[PDB]
C-alpha cells in the first residue's frame, strides 16, 4: 500500500494498526491488506512487535474467508512460542471457523484441564454454543460463567 | 625523602590498570546480558 | 519535530567545550602562580547561553499534557466500535460466502 | 587552593567509582526484575476478591441507578451472601562498599564547595589519618556513599518507573467488615434535578462541524 | 470536573518530575562549571528553578485548568530531590574542574 494510493512509512502503518487494535474495529479487509504487507516487506524492521500483528492478521483473515494467511501466521506463532495457550486458542478458533466443533471442544477441555483458572476457553465454548443457534444453553452457560 | 602521613596526596605506584579495565568490561557485559534476559522473560510471560 | 534533539545535543556539546576551556585555563593559571583570579567573560557568556538553550530545548521534549476530564476522549467514540467483543467472535455469516465461497 | 593534587588521581580514581556504582545499580535493577516473584491463586480467592470489589463499587456508586434497583441489590449481599530475593537487594551494597574501601581508600578525593563544621569531619574522612585537615576534603568511601545516595532521581529518569535502590487475611473478617460498612449507606439519587440543569443554557454545538468527513484509511 | 481520570494526572506528574530532575542536574552542572561557591551559588539554583517554572507556563499556556487544579504544584513541586542532585553535580564538576 506504500506508494500504492498512499504515501506512508512503516511507522505510520504500525501506528494505524495499533489504533485499530485499541478500539475494537472489525473492518477485516483493510486490516488484512495492511497486515500482509507489513508482515512480508517489513518483517525485520519490527524488532518485537510482529507477534501481536500476527494474531490480529490471523483473526482478520479468518473473518475474511482467506485461510492460507491464517495458516501461515498460525505456523509462525506456533514455531516462535512452543506450548503456549494463546496459540491453542487460535488453533481452536481456526478449527471452529471450518465447522469442526468437536475438535475445538476437546481442545478447550484439554486447555481447561491443564489450567483450571483460564477464562478464554470458557468464552470460546460459549461462542461455539452460540454459533449453532442454541440460545438458551448459551445464556445459561454465560450466567454460570458470570 | 620521608612521608610522615603515608603520602595521601599522590596515587600509589602499584596501581593495577588491567584489573580496573577488566572489572569495568565485566560490569558492562553483565548489564547487557541481564537486560536481554529480563526483556525475554517479560516477553515470554506476556504470551503465557 | 526532531530538531529539538539536535538543539539539546548542540547545547550539551557547547557546555562540555566550555568546561574543557575553563579547566585548561585554570591549569594554565596555576602554573604562573597569579592570584588575580581572572575569569574570562566570554567563557561565562558561552556557558550561560549553552545552559539556557539546553534547558529551553529540553523543556519541549518531555511530552505533552493530557486533559484530566474523564469524559474528554469519549466525545468521538461511537456505538459501532463498542458492540464488538473480540472474545465472542463468531465466523458464521455471509462474509465467507461473499469472498471465495 | 591549600593542597596540590596529582591529575592522575583525578583521571583514575574519580570516574571509576561513578561508573561502577551506576552499572551496579543497573545490574541490581535488572536482576531484581529477572527473579521478582511467581505467585499462584486458587479460584475461590479471586472469586471472593471480585465479589468484594463489586460490593465496594456498589457502595461507592449506587447513586447513579434507580433507588429500587439499589435496594434490590442491597437486599442481596446481606441475607444470602454476607452471612451465608532480598539478599541481593541490600547485601551487595555493603559488599561493594567494603571492597571499594579495601582497594581504593588512602587519598584525598575531592572537596565540597560550601563551608562546613567539625561535625561533618568524622563522616567524610574515613580513610585519611590527618588531624587538623578541614572537613570539606573527602575520602574515597565518603565519595562512593555520596554517589550512591545521589542517583535515585537519575535512575527514575533514565529507567522506567522507580527501582534499583533501597527504600486478604481472613475472608470471614473481610465479609463482616463489608457487611458492617454497607449497612449504614443510604441511596441519594443524583438525577433528581438534571432537567433543570440542562435547561439553563443552550447546547454546546460549537467546534463540532469543523474538519471534513473521513473518506478512507489514513 | 465531576469525574477525574488517574492516568492523566499520573502522566502529568511524571512529566513534571522529568523536567524538574533534568533541569536540576543541568543547573548543578553549570553552577559547578562557573566555579561559584558558597551560599552565593545557592542563589543561582533558586534562579534556575524560577526559570523552569516560567517555561512550564509557556508549556501550559492558557486553559491550564484542564490539566491542573492550581499552579501551586507547578511552582513549588519537587524542591527536595532536585536540591540533592544539584549539590551532587555541583561537587562533582567543581572537583573535576577547579581542583587539580
UniProtKB/Swiss-Prot annotation, chain B:
Protein name: ER membrane protein complex subunit 1
Gene label: EMC1
Clinical note on disease: Cerebellar atrophy, visual impairment, and psychomotor retardation: An autosomal recessive, neurodegenerative disorder characterized by developmental delay, intellectual disability, hypotonia, scoliosis, cerebellar atrophy, and variable dysmorphic features.
Cytoplasmic side: 39-48
Subunit details: Component of the ER membrane protein complex (EMC).
Upper lineage: Eukaryota, Metazoa, Chordata, Craniata, Vertebrata
Membrane-spanning intervals of the chain: 18-38
Protein task: Part of the endoplasmic reticulum membrane protein complex (EMC) that enables the energy-independent insertion into endoplasmic reticulum membranes of newly synthesized membrane proteins. Preferentially accommodates proteins with transmembrane domains that are weakly hydrophobic or contain destabilizing features such as charged and aromatic residues. Involved in the cotranslational insertion of multi-pass membrane proteins in which stop-transfer membrane-anchor sequences become ER membrane spanning helices.
Sequence similarity: Belongs to the EMC1 family.
Full-length numbering of the shown residues: 946 to 993 of 993
UniProt-annotated location(s): Endoplasmic reticulum membrane
Curated annotation (Swiss-Prot), chain C:
Source taxon at top rank: Eukaryota
Bilayer disposition of the protein: Multi-pass membrane protein
Transmembrane regions listed in the UniProt entry: 2-20, 42-61
UniProtKB keywords: Endoplasmic reticulum, Endosome, Golgi apparatus, Magnesium, Membrane, Phosphoprotein, Transmembrane, Transmembrane helix, Transport
Annotated GO MF terms: cobalt ion transmembrane transporter activity; ferrous iron transmembrane transporter activity; inorganic cation transmembrane transporter activity; magnesium ion transmembrane transporter activity
GO BP term, pick one: protein insertion into ER membrane by stop-transfer membrane-anchor sequence
GO cellular component term, pick one: Golgi apparatus
Topology, Lumenal side: 21-41
Cell location: Endoplasmic reticulum membrane; Golgi apparatus membrane; Early endosome membrane
Predominant location category: endoplasmic reticulum
Protein role: Part of the endoplasmic reticulum membrane protein complex (EMC) that enables the energy-independent insertion into endoplasmic reticulum membranes of newly synthesized membrane proteins. Preferentially accommodates proteins with transmembrane domains that are weakly hydrophobic or contain destabilizing features such as charged and aromatic residues. Involved in the cotranslational insertion of multi-pass membrane proteins in which stop-transfer membrane-anchor sequences become ER membrane spanning helices.
Binding partners and assembly: Component of the ER membrane protein complex (EMC).
Family: Belongs to the membrane magnesium transporter (TC 1.A.67) family.
Protein name: ER membrane protein complex subunit 5
Curated annotation (Swiss-Prot), chain D:
Lumenal compartment segments: 1-11, 103-140
Domain of life (superkingdom): Eukaryota
Entry keyword set: Endoplasmic reticulum, Membrane, Transmembrane, Transmembrane helix
Coiled coil: none
SMART domains xrefs: DUF106 (SM01415)
TM stretches of this protein: 12-35, 87-102, 141-159
A GO CC term assigned to this protein in UniProt: endoplasmic reticulum membrane
Entry-linked InterPro entries: EMC3, EMC3/TMCO1
Topology feature Cytoplasmic, residues: 36-86, 160-218
Membrane topology: Multi-pass membrane protein
Function: Part of the endoplasmic reticulum membrane protein complex (EMC) that enables the energy-independent insertion into endoplasmic reticulum membranes of newly synthesized membrane proteins. Preferentially accommodates proteins with transmembrane domains that are weakly hydrophobic or contain destabilizing features such as charged and aromatic residues. Involved in the cotranslational insertion of multi-pass membrane proteins in which stop-transfer membrane-anchor sequences become ER membrane spanning helices.
PANTHER family reported in the protein's UniProt record: ER MEMBRANE PROTEIN COMPLEX SUBUNIT 3 (PTHR13116:SF10)
Family from the record: Belongs to the EMC3 family.
Record-given protein name: ER membrane protein complex subunit 3
From Swiss-Prot, chain E:
Topology Cytoplasmic: residue spans: 1-18, 62-79
Record keyword Transmembrane present: yes
Quaternary structure (record): Component of the ER membrane protein complex (EMC).
Location (main, coarse): endoplasmic reticulum
Family recorded in the similarity comment: Belongs to the EMC6 family.
Keywords annotated in UniProt: Acetylation, Endoplasmic reticulum, Membrane, Transmembrane, Transmembrane helix
Membrane topology label: Multi-pass membrane protein
Annotated GO biological process: autophagosome assembly; protein insertion into ER membrane by stop-transfer membrane-anchor sequence; tail-anchored membrane protein insertion into ER membrane
Superkingdom, natural source: Eukaryota
Species annotation: Homo sapiens (Human)
Function of the protein: Part of the endoplasmic reticulum membrane protein complex (EMC) that enables the energy-independent insertion into endoplasmic reticulum membranes of newly synthesized membrane proteins. Preferentially accommodates proteins with transmembrane domains that are weakly hydrophobic or contain destabilizing features such as charged and aromatic residues. Involved in the cotranslational insertion of multi-pass membrane proteins in which stop-transfer membrane-anchor sequences become ER membrane spanning helices.
Taxonomic classification: Eukaryota, Metazoa, Chordata, Craniata, Vertebrata
Protein's recorded name: ER membrane protein complex subunit 6
Lumenal side: 35-40, 97-100
Pfam families: EMC6 (PF07019)
One cellular-component annotation, GO: endoplasmic reticulum membrane
Subcellular compartments: Endoplasmic reticulum membrane
TM regions (residue ranges): 19-34, 41-61, 80-96
Keyword Glycoprotein: no
